[PDB]
Design a protein around this ligand. Sequence first.
Ligand SMILES: *[C@@]12=NC3=[C]C([C])=C([C])[C]=C3N([C][C]([O])[C]([O])[C]([O])[C]OP([O])([O])=O)C1=NC(=O)[N]C2=O
Length: 109
Amino acid sequence: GLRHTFVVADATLPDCPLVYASEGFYAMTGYGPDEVLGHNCRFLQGEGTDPKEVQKIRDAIKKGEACSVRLLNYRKDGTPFWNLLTVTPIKTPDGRVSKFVGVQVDVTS
Ligand SMILES: *[C@@]12=NC3=[C]C([C])=C([C])[C]=C3N([C][C]([O])[C]([O])[C]([O])[C]OP([O])([O])=O)C1=NC(=O)[N]C2=O
């Protein structure tokens, strides 16, 4: 299959911290668990990230909807890569959002 990475954000905490990341996520971004867990995913953004697409994810997360955007992201060493990000909300039976899950693909090609 295509090369992707996977994370889980906790939506019971107000700023959606990451609580789990696949090994490829660390290997792709250059960050380790000590710098990823407990933090919001936006640390991967930087100068060239498009604010209009960031705002697309912000709104989908507040509305508890799925969302797919492509973002410029930066590895720990500063170098950029194009991240095709799909976020999916996970609900409890009472309709509340408990977790957000994300598939991240590096589409720099
Ligand atoms: C990030 N992946 C990612 C994965 C999940 C499951 C979630 C919920 C969010 C992300 N983000 C974005 C970030 O957490 C936030 O949702 C947005 O930046 C919008 O909110 P703000 O407050 O910044 O307007 C991811 N962002 C990335 O840049 N790279 C990812 O891999």
